[PDB]
Design an enzyme around this catalytic site. Structure first.
Site, short mmCIF file in Angstrom:
data_model
loop_
_atom_site.label_atom_id
_atom_site.label_comp_id
_atom_site.label_asym_id
_atom_site.label_seq_id
_atom_site.Cartn_x
_atom_site.Cartn_y
_atom_site.Cartn_z
N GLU A 185 0.87 -1.15 0.00
CA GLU A 185 0.00 0.00 0.00
C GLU A 185 0.91 1.22 0.00
O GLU A 185 1.96 1.21 0.67
CB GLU A 185 -0.93 0.02 1.22
CG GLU A 185 -1.32 1.41 1.67
CD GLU A 185 -1.29 1.55 3.17
OE1 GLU A 185 -0.61 0.74 3.84
OE2 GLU A 185 -1.95 2.48 3.69
N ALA A 231 -2.32 -6.09 2.64
CA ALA A 231 -2.67 -7.48 2.88
C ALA A 231 -3.71 -7.65 3.98
O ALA A 231 -4.00 -8.78 4.39
CB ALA A 231 -1.42 -8.29 3.22
N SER A 275 7.88 -6.41 10.07
CA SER A 275 7.12 -6.73 11.27
C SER A 275 6.60 -8.17 11.21
O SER A 275 6.43 -8.75 10.13
CB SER A 275 5.95 -5.76 11.45
OG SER A 275 5.06 -5.82 10.34
N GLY A 288 2.33 -7.61 10.74
CA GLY A 288 1.83 -7.09 9.48
C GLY A 288 1.60 -8.20 8.47
O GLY A 288 2.35 -9.17 8.39
N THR A 303 -3.48 -2.78 16.80
CA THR A 303 -4.93 -2.93 16.74
C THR A 303 -5.35 -4.26 16.12
O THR A 303 -6.55 -4.55 16.08
CB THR A 303 -5.55 -1.77 15.96
OG1 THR A 303 -4.79 -1.53 14.77
CG2 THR A 303 -5.57 -0.51 16.81
N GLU A 351 -2.29 -11.24 14.83
CA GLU A 351 -0.83 -11.19 14.68
C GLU A 351 -0.13 -12.47 15.11
O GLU A 351 0.89 -12.82 14.49
CB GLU A 351 -0.29 -9.98 15.43
CG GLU A 351 -0.38 -8.68 14.65
CD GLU A 351 0.06 -7.49 15.46
OE1 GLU A 351 -0.68 -7.09 16.39
OE2 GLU A 351 1.16 -6.95 15.18
N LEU A 376 28.78 -9.68 6.82
CA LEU A 376 27.60 -10.38 7.33
C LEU A 376 27.91 -11.83 7.68
O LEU A 376 27.22 -12.44 8.51
CB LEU A 376 26.47 -10.31 6.30
CG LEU A 376 25.94 -8.92 5.98
CD1 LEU A 376 24.92 -8.99 4.87
CD2 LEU A 376 25.34 -8.29 7.23
N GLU A 433 30.34 -12.85 9.39
CA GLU A 433 30.86 -12.91 10.75
C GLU A 433 29.77 -12.84 11.81
O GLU A 433 30.08 -13.00 13.00
CB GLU A 433 31.88 -11.77 10.96
CG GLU A 433 32.87 -12.02 12.09
CD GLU A 433 34.15 -11.23 11.93
OE1 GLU A 433 34.24 -10.43 10.96
OE2 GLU A 433 35.07 -11.40 12.76
#
Ligand SMILES: Nc1nc2c(ncn2[C@@H]2O[C@H](COP(=O)(O)OP(=O)(O)OP(=O)(O)O)[C@@H](O)[C@H]2O)c(=O)[nH]1
Ligand SMILES: Nc1ncnc2c1ncn2[C@@H]1O[C@H](COP(=O)(O)OP(=O)(O)CP(=O)(O)O)[C@@H](O)[C@H]1O
Ligand SMILES: Nc1nc2c(ncn2[C@@H]2O[C@H](COP(=O)(O)OP(=O)(O)O)[C@@H](O)[C@H]2O)c(=O)[nH]1
Ligand SMILES: Cc1cc(F)cc(S(N)(=O)=O)c1
Ligand SMILES: [Ca+2]
Ligand SMILES: [Ca+2]
Ligand SMILES: [Ca+2]
Ligand SMILES: [Mg+2]
Ligand SMILES: [Mg+2]
Ligand SMILES: [Mg+2]
EC number: 3.6.5.-
Lengths: 437, 349, 425, 54
Positions: free
Chosen positions: A71, A99, A140, A143, A179, A183, A252, A254
């Site tokens: 969005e 979504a 997240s 989400g 809200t 989740e 990355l 390491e």
């Protein structure tokens, strides 16, 4: 010099990315227009900040970032905000409807239609990398996009970038600042399908960020900007090694080598101190030992849990500011004799220490006060499994009644993916219990 | 209007506390799976501490200290005493003990034998006792080890107090029970009322085969003892009588001869683990009732036997003590709209 | 651009929808001619959700007015904001529906439904990204009930993946026009069970009892009952019309409020409800206590007879959002026996900085409660009292229906009650 | 308490301390899963239209 491409997915990822790149700019002296006076090589160079910033012939320093949201409302702010000039439009990707907090929607229904587009934009940033290290994925759990599209993206990245690493900065769900009711579903769905694709993930519990803002910053009702400015301070401490000169966590690769001896157990616990309110006229500047000792207080952990009742597998101390090796080890002794730090016998009882002399940078007008020294502890405790238990339990209460399952099945997902996902968490909890008890 | 949930229907103690809480008209009981609770009377085993203190707007309180099992487990208490420098391996109030795993499974088998061989050679009393949380008294080390292997769980061998203080008339062994309550602030409160679970059988040192005059448990005396309830009701002598006895017979008081050593032991144990189980800066608060069991020898020296993390109360003391829990432990965090029945053991946190 | 297409059908639907557009039009600063004269950008931030923008900065509501008789809609056009509505969006006939569901769903309404869909399609084609539809109507009449559900069934055929929302007025013998209202309501309720995602149940008895007892109106009028519905409609849509950390579109609301496809009938509530001692400052606790009280609920159902599956509260006005959280968690923590424990944190609260016109602050209540079964129980009983004797069936059989179709609707709703009953235990 | 691997530069330093010694799916398989769910959506919508046609 090897590059790192950062990927921000969903509302949480994009907003957190807004607070991080804001901070990366204040640290590296990059202006809103992309200029960097201190950089003496115009339009190129393999410096340490080039791991996160590309350079145009005109002297503009462009983040190596990709922003994806199903969005456009959240990414539209970036297109006209303070840092509208840092990014070019290709870097920002937005759909037309989200979504609806529905993992299945972001993964299957909408995800299928935009996945190839994101990979294309990512390939463009990759084509500017002479030795890409990997990706930093911000998203997240709750989400529908953060959970749904991210897991699809990860699967594809492992296919198009096999030998590359992938670290996550995940936002753990907390009722006080959400809200949505579904989740837990989304969290356990995305952790299941993302586990074998992520080499190391840093969970931040919004419940912890919220109370650190109310307790330390005296913010009665914190906003996302307040929560995000704090979250990026920790992220800056974690990525500082990749952006500045150093020898600890230089690439990355390491991060798994130093923090993840067992693959599935790749969720380090982050602890940061000090967090002082800027409203305080002046505060007693804490010492190396004092800030170090705080690293073992639950009140400054990104996930509320009790490390005293776990077993450590690794432990990195990242220091920024006025700190010398002599001071670090002194405090370390004082804490082992006072604190309960039980390691697993198949891991060395030791600490890897990194020191960067530039003290933490604070956003002018932000909530955090300037400090002379700060530290961020990355510890791999079995105690973080508490977060999985809390979450898995909430999953069980709902799934026992199949509440809200129809929304997922209705997007094409099979009900079996639920139980297949939950049984994987049950396996994840057992691993922790086997390593700790 | 405070709310609480009950998750251990077998707890005689907190069944009264719950009965009392409801009697205040200000506490409300919920289903055992409703997460919106201020207070949890939690189960014994596998209490999910990790799910506490995550409910917005609820200060939650639990009746168990996470990690206190280190002190209420036979084998754990031994390791904690030997390894902890606060208690050291030479702690003078705990019987010489050793951790002995059965051979079908670190282990202190050889360490025990060396100490045993030393006692067998030096003509000293070499009577030990084996036991486990899931009993055999013998002077031959062969009988103690062979008994443990026949089992499949961890055991502990420790020195058997061969010179126990015998009450008269009767010439009978006994033990002493003290209830200790630690609140969320980690204040150590000792209940002014103790109990002596006495043996109704005359102590006999030339025969450890019959375990009725050696074991002072309320169940073995009421099941395997023939003089149950002769000298005192229910083989239980409370502090009033036992203190009067110590004065007529030994010309001393229960405070000076025994209580000072008890209060010193309670402090030592709890202070030792405070850093490991304290909830000072935690997202939830803990409090817990403990039951200490001591032994008193003929030299009026106190010895620590074991610590119970889920003990029951003497019938005559349920009302007084249960009410006491509601005052300093629960309502201290959830007030309601003396002459304390406890003895505060001040200490450095 | 997440546009919503509004539809109002029949007498009750158009009069209520009329007042709805009158209320929010004032809140967004739109005058009776579609011109904006507000003082805050917040009024226009999400203005295109319900309004189209015509030439000259004119804002035209995205509403389609429908009726089988010209009577009611003529009043709207002559009403205060009648000029604001698009002229072509008026679709009406002359035969009427005679408060008959069959006429509205099969005979008369079927002759006109194709033209209404032609206007709907016109409004959709101009939507950048259409969220879904919302319908206002009564269930006890003939047009809003019989044809309204016919429209929904056909809209779902042409837009199967858009959200369908309704504001449905349930009949009550206390505020009744004809004795066939239970028949029409039972037939529509089955339609809604199948083809809507969210239905705000508005009971005319609850509205009446509020006006009489709470509001102290000696003799209420349909106009009085509509002032409430207006305020309620403005409340439940505040999340969609104004900015805030809530965001929330129709599909997100549906996904967090509806744990089961058929149990999507909500109980709305509004606070304050003050009789003219009207200038008093209402505290955040007073708002919360009232918002959950049954007397403030428009379903005529006693929630303490069922259990909340989900609950959504919207607070409006400059207030202490910290104090809002405190009071909300206080209600959950002092009445947790009424919230199902198998849905963690099923009580969510949003805040909006713009209060309704003339109120320092307000609170709207949206509840998915198993207590609503009492409403369907009343309808089912009144239905069966007549159908057992076949009384008044000739009105319907004369339009082509059969007794079989009634018995099914009867069983369809009794099943609905049984579904609400198993989730209450 | 041993310090090992000390690295020093102008912007800081790093080192290690030891207190105690110790004791995927192809792109074909992904396209199938994405299409499989898309097939279960088409079938579900087919039954709704079939329901509405009736
Ligand atoms: N720390 C932090 N958390 C956030 C932020 N934004 C959202 N969240 C958390 O993320 C969760 C919801 O996920 P979102 O990111 O909003 O969802 P999404 O990725 O946009 O996916 P959609 O369902 O399509 O909107 C909630 O629990 C929020 O608390 C943020 O800016 N910072
Ligand atoms: N080292 C020792 N010397 C003398 N007596 C001992 C002893 N160890 C145990 N006892 C006797 O055993 C009894 C305590 O047994 P123990 O506590 O080990 O088993 P238990 O835990 O099942 C009973 P409880 O938990 O109720 O105290 C005491 O009455 C004491 O007389
Ligand atoms: N709240 C309210 N209810 C109404 C109004 N007008 C009619 N009703 C109710 O709606 C039902 C009759 O429906 P009606 O709208 O008159 O039928 P229709 O015009 O043919 O669709 C009855 O139960 C009435 O109580 C009104 O203005 N307000
Ligand atoms: C520090 C900062 C900068 C920014 F541009 C946006 C944010 S946000 N999206 O979290 O409100 C925060
Ligand atoms: Ca350069
Ligand atoms: Ca991989
Ligand atoms: Ca005709
Ligand atoms: Mg979103
Ligand atoms: Mg025992
Ligand atoms: Mg009418």
């Amino acid at each position: 010099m090897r590059e790192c491409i950062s990927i921000h997915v969903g509302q949480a990822g994009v907003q957190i990315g807004n607070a991080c790149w804001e901070l990366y700019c204040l640290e590296h002296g990059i202006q809103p227009d992309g200029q960097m006076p201190s950089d003496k090589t115009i339009g190129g160079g393999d410096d340490s900040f080039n791991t996160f910033f590309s350079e145009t012939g005109a002297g503009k320093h462009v983040p190596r970032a990709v922003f994806v949201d199903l969005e456009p409302t959240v990414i539209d702010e970036v297109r006209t905000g303070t840092y509208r000039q840092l990014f070019h439009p290709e870097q920002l990707i937005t759909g037309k409807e989200d979504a609806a907090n529905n993992y299945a929607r972001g993964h299957y229904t909408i995800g299928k239609e935009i996945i190839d587009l994101v990979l294309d934009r990512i390939r463009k940033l990759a084509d500017q990398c002479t030795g890409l290290q990997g990706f930093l994925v911000f998203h997240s759990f709750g989400g529908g996009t953060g959970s749904g599209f991210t897991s699809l993206l990860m699967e594809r990245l492992s296919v198009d970038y096999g030998k590359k690493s992938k670290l996550e900065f995940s936002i753990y769900p907390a009722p006080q600042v959400s809200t949505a009711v579904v989740e837990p579903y989304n969290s356990i769905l995305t952790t299941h399908t993302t586990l074998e694709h992520s080499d190391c993930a840093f969970m931040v519990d919004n419940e912890a960020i919220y109370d650190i803002c109310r307790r330390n910053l005296d913010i009665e009702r914190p906003t996302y900007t307040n929560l995000n400015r704090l979250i990026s301070q920790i992220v800056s401490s974690i990525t500082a090694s990749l952006r500045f000169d150093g020898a600890l966590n230089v690439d990355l690769t390491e991060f798994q080598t130093n923090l993840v001896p067992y693959p599935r157990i790749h969720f380090p616990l982050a602890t940061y101190a000090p967090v002082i309110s800027a409203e305080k006229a002046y505060h007693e500047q804490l010492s190396v030992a004092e800030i170090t000792n705080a690293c073992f207080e639950p009140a400054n952990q990104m996930v509320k849990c009790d490390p005293r009742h776990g077993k450590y597998m690794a432990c990195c101390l990242l220091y920024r500011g006025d700190v010398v090796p002599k001071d670090v080890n002194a405090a370390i002794a004082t804490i082992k004799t006072k604190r309960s730090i039980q390691f697993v016998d198949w891991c060395p009882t030791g600490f890897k220490v990194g020191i960067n002399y530039q003290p933490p940078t604070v956003v002018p007008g932000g909530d955090l006060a300037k400090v002379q020294r700060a530290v961020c502890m990355l510890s791999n405790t079995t105690a973080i499994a508490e977060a999985w238990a809390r979450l898995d339990h909430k999953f069980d209460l709902m799934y026992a009644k199949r509440a809200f399952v129809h929304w997922y099945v209705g997007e094409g997902m099979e009900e079996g993916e639920f139980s297949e996902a939950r049984e994987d968490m049950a396996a994840l909890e057992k691993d922790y219990e086997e390593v700790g008890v | 209007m405070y709310t609480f949930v009950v998750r251990d229907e077998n707890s005689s103690v907190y069944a009264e506390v719950s009965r009392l809480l409801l009697a205040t008209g200000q506490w409300k009981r919920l289903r055992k799976d409703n997460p919106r609770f201020n207070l949890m009377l939690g189960e014994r085993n596998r209490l999910p501490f990790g799910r506490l203190g995550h409910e917005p707007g609820l200060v939650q309180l639990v009746n168990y200290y996470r990690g206190a099992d280190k002190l209420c487990r036979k084998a754990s208490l031994v390791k904690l005493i030997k390894t902890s420098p606060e208690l050291s391996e030479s702690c003078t109030w705990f019987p010489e003990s050793y951790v002995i795993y059965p051979t079908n499974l670190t282990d202190e088998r050889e360490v025990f034998l060396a100490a045993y061989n030393r006692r067998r050679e030096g003509r000293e009393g070499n009577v030990w006792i084996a036991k486990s949380s899931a009993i055999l008294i013998s002077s031959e080390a062969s009988e103690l080890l062979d008994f443990i292997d026949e089992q499949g769980q961890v055991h502990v061998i420790q020195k058997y107090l061969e010179k126990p203080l015998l009450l008269e008339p009767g010439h009978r062994k006994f033990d002493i029970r003290s209830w200790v309550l630690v609140d969320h602030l980690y204040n150590i409160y000792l209940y002014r009322e103790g109990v002596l679970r006495t043996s109704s059988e005359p102590y006999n040192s030339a025969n450890f085969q019959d375990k009725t005059c050696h074991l002072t448990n309320h169940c073995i005396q009421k099941e395997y003892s023939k003089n149950y309830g002769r000298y005192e009701e229910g083989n239980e002598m409370f502090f009033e009588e036992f203190n009067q006895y110590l004065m007529d017979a030994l010309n001393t008081t229960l405070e000076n001869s025994i209580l000072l050593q008890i209060k010193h032991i309670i402090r030592s144990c709890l202070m030792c683990i405070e850093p490991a189980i304290s909830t000072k800066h935690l997202h939830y608060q803990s409090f817990q009732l403990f039951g200490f069991d001591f032994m008193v020898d003929e030299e009026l020296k106190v010895w620590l036997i074991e610590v119970n993390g889920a003990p029951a109360c003497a019938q005559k003391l349920y009302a007084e003590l249960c009410q006491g829990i509601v005052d300093v432990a629960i309502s201290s965090v959830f007030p309601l709209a003396p002459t304390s029945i406890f003895i505060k053991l001040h200490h450095h946190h | 651009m997440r546009e919503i297409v509004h539809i109002q059908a029949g007498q009750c639907g158009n009069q209520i929808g009329a007042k709805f557009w009158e209320v929010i039009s004032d809140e967004h600063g739109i005058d009776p001619t579609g011109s904006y004269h507000g003082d805050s950008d917040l009024q226009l931030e999400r203005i295109n959700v319900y309004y189209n923008e015509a030439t000259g900065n004119k804002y035209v509501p995205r509403a389609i007015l429908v009726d089988l008789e010209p009577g009611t809609m003529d009043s709207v056009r002559s009403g205060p904001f009648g000029q604001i509505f698009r002229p072509d969006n008026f679709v009406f006939g002359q035969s009427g529906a005679g408060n008959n569901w069959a006429k509205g769903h099969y005979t008369e309404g079927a002759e006109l439904v194709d033209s209404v869909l032609d206007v709907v399609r016109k409004e959709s084609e101009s939507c950048d990204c259409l969220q879904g539809f919302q319908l206002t109507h009564s269930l006890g009449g003939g047009t809003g009930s019989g044809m309204g559900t016919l429209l929904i069934s056909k809209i779902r055929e042409e837009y199967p993946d858009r959200i369908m929302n309704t504001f449905s007025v349930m009949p009550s013998p206390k505020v009744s026009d004809t004795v066939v209202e239970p028949y029409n309501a039972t037939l529509s309720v089955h339609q809604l069970v199948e083809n809507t995602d969210e239905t705000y149940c508005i009971d005319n008895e609850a509205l009446y009892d509020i006006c009489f007892r709470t509001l102290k109106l000696t003799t209420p009028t349909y106009g009085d009952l509509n002032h409430l519905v207006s305020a309620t409609m403005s409340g439940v849509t505040t999340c969609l019309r104004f900015p805030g950390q809530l965001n929330a579109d129709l599909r997100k609301l549906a996904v967090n409020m509806v744990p089961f496809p058929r149990l999507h009938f909500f109980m709305p509530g509004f606070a304050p409800l003050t009789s003219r001692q009207q200038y008093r400052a209402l505290t955040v606790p007073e708002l919360t206590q009232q918002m959950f009280d049954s007397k403030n609920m428009m379903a005529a159902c006693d929630p303490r007879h069922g259990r909340y599956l989900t609950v959504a509260a919207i607070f409006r006005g400059r207030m202490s959002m910290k104090e809002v959280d405190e009071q909300m968690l206080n209600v959950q923590n002092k009445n947790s026996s009424y919230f199902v424990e198998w849905i963690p944190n099923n009580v969510k609260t949003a805040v909006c900085d713009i209060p309704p016109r003339g109120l320092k602050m307000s609170a709207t209540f949206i509840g998915n409660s198993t207590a609503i079964q009492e409403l369907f129980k009343r309808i089912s009983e009144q239905f069966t009292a007549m159908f057992r004797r076949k009384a008044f069936l000739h009105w319907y059989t004369g339009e082509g229906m059969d007794e079989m179709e009634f018995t099914e609707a009867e069983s369809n709703m009794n099943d609905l009650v049984s579904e609400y009953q198993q989730y209450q235990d | 308490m041993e310090v090992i691997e000390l690295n020093k530069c102008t912007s800081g330093q790093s080192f290690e301390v030891i207190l105690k010694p110790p004791s995927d799916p192809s792109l074909e398989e992904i396209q199938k899963k994405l299409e499989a769910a898309e097939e279960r959506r088409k079938y579900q919508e087919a039954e709704l239209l079939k329901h509405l046609a009736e």
